[PDB]
Design a binder for this molecule. Structure first.
Ligand SMILES: [Hg+2]
Ligand SMILES: [Zn+2]
Length: 258
């Protein structure tokens, strides 16, 4: 029926409706640190989020997205392995039902409690929908979350969750500053890959930061209270909305550091 993360419509079934699931550049992947190659020609990333305009938060039935105004070069990513400017359109998380799982990418097979994806689209393409028809159409910044100390900057997101508990609900969500979600270091791994949810388009340049951010147990706990279901439908908690690691195939993971 429609895709999800359950036993009957889970990642193992996606290929039936989206054959690209068994493609050559699928994400996420396991990051083998001993095989990733340091590339000294990679430039430092340039994250310019001071003019960011958040608009809304929405429960789309698979996760919650915070959306941004992308009509101008307000919040952009450049440098790193990228050519051109990429505009932030939305961010969302993947998390688990337990602290030992929830990330999509793994590092030497290590799974984190969650993973944040900041999705950006290549401005040369004019709009999001055009960017997803190109091999260099998107850039996703991935950040691992480990449970430890609370992250002050995440608290405003945590607090609005109650209001978008069920699928289809949205809430105004202005003046949120994504800078409060970044780790101190911008060292990263990069590889060519895809979106991790259907349509699984292979248009992404992945930029996975080495340094995880800490979140508190209570922060994570509130994510686990969301619902996959719509209002008035039987309750199915929104947990484990992550795709397992895919074969690397003919791809090389590059490191911005050694
Ligand atoms: Hg593409
Ligand atoms: Zn994602």
């Amino acid at each position: 029926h429609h895709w999800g993360y359950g036993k009957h419509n889970g990642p193992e079934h996606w290929h039936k409706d989206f054959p690209i699931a068994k493609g050559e550049r699928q994400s996420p992947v396991d990051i083998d640190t001993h095989t990733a190659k340091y590339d000294p020609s990679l430039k430092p990333l340039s994250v310019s989020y001071d003019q960011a305009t958040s608009l809304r938060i929405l429960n789309n039935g698979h996760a919650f997205n915070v959306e941004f105004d992308d009509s101008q070069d307000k919040a952009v990513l450049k440098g790193g392995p990228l050519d051109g400017t990429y505009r932030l359109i939305q961010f969302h998380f993947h998390w688990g039902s337990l602290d030992g799982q929830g990330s999509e990418h793994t590092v030497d097979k290590k799974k984190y409690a969650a993973e944040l994806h900041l999705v950006h689209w290549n401005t040369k393409y004019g709009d999001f929908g055009k960017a997803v028809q190109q091999p260099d159409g998107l850039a996703v910044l991935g950040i691992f979350l480990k449970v430890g100390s609370a992250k002050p900057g995440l608290q405003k997101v945590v607090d609005v969750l109650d209001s978008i508990k069920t699928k289809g609900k949205s809430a105004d969500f202005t003046n949120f500053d994504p800078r409060g979600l970044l780790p101190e270091s911008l060292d990263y791994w990069t590889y060519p890959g895809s979106l991790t949810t259907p349509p699984l388009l292979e248009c992404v340049t992945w930029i996975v930061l080495k340094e995880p951010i800490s979140v508190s147990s209570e922060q994570v706990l509130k994510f686990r209270k969301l619902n996959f279901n719509g209002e008035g439908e039987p309750e199915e908690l929104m947990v484990d909305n992550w795709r397992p690691a895919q074969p690397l195939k003919n791809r090389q993971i590059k490191a911005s550091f050694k």
